[PDB]
């Protein structure tokens, strides 16, 4: 069953072509009517918009060029767009258009109306193992794909995982995604999901994404993360210790998988070994998982959000709106030339 090797090989050729000669200026602001904010993160906002000529809705990520510079995220933003436009996988949100003006950078993605896994997770409390397993399999295949292209995601979390109309995951936010061979050192990500090697400024690799998968699986199944506190600094102390505790309801299989993902020793962490991703795929916790079926989206979703219209946002919280300004003077022109 190594058509996956051939699959990845062709997938790589496809990626490299686009990574080599990226798409640019495929749209403009006036082609959309801005409706409402869907969510916000460290910087910029994501708005639900309607494309005039087609009538389709999209999620427009808006980035203030001046804020990007202030926060020293230039390179990261260029990575985000360059990578987004080049990738293609069933569980990666699609970048439909991208462009820029005097003040901002815009990345228009396909609108995923189901909302964040985060909201559903907090609301319901926690997911059953089969439910969590369903989502986990999708991330596993996603990281196998990304990693095969020398990409590190670095921002795994329920907040960046959207549920589509069929109940499948759509990964968003490549703000910290990077294409790297070897190690890297940036201190980035979300505190609760940081692998110990990131916190210890030792330098790290793809293995950090596998640690984050452990954190994700734990949080979905438990309802709360494996390492939490009121301040990030206290969180790092707990992560570094490595001492983890599992809820009484955790199956023996789940705990064994988690002990292998939330593994401080890189020579022992699953996903980072000789057999690589297959150590995870072949794990007992994933025994009932039909990997091909998952990739083909032929498995029945355990949860299908309520669909009330093409531009319905009932699955997202409401946010304080603010005018999208555009200066008559070009800002940071040289810095974002390739965007």
């Amino acid at each position: 069953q190594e058509s996956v090797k051939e699959f990845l090989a062709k997938a790589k050729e496809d990626f490299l072509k686009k990574w080599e000669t990226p798409s640019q200026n495929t749209a403009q602001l006036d082609q959309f009517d801005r409706i409402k904010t869907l969510g916000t993160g460290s910087f910029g906002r994501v708005m639900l918009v309607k494309h005039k000529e087609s009538g389709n809705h999209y999620a427009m990520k808006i980035l203030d060029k001046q804020k990007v510079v202030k926060l020293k995220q230039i390179e990261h933003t260029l990575n985000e767009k360059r990578i987004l436009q080049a990738v293609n996988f069933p569980f990666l949100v699609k970048l439909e258009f991208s462009f820029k003006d005097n003040s901002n950078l815009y990345m228009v993605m396909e609108y995923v109306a189901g909302g964040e896994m985060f909201s559903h997770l907090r609301r319901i409390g926690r997911f059953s193992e089969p439910h969590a397993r369903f989502y986990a399999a999708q991330i596993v295949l996603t990281f196998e794909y990304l990693h095969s292209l020398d990409l590190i995601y670095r921002d795994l979390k329920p907040e960046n995982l959207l549920i589509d109309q069929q109940g499948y995951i759509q990964v968003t936010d490549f703000g910290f995604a990077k294409r790297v061979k070897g190690r890297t050192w940036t201190l980035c990500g979300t505190p609760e999901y940081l692998a110990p090697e990131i916190i210890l400024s030792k330098g790290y690799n793809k293995a950090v994404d596998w640690w984050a998968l452990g954190v994700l699986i734990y949080e979905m199944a438990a309802g709360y993360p494996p390492f939490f506190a009121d301040q990030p600094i206290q969180i790092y102390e707990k992560i570094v210790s490595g001492k983890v505790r599992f809820p009484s309801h955790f199956s023996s299989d789940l705990k064994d998988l988690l002990r292998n993902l939330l593994q401080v020793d890189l020579t022992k962490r699953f996903g980072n070994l000789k057999n690589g991703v297959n150590d995870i795929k072949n794990h007992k916790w994933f025994a009932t998982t039909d990997w091909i079926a998952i990739y083909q989206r032929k498995v029945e979703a355990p949860f299908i959000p309520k669909f009330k219209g093409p531009g319905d946002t009932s699955n997202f919280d409401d946010y304080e709106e603010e005018e999208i300004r555009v200066s008559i003077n070009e800002k940071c022109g040289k810095e974002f030339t390739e965007f």
Binding site: G39, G41, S42, L71, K72, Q73, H76, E116, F118, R122, D155, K157, E159, G175, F176, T186, L187, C188, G189, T190, P191, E192, G223, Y224, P225, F228, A229, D230, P232, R245, P247
Partner: peptide, 20 residues
């Protein structure tokens, strides 16, 4: 319980990423 302690903490809402 761990649930209670989580629920009463200040990090149950959407978490922001860092760049430190």
């Amino acid at each position: 319980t761990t649930y209670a302690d989580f629920i009463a903490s200040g990090r149950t809402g959407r978490r922001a990423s860092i760049h430190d």
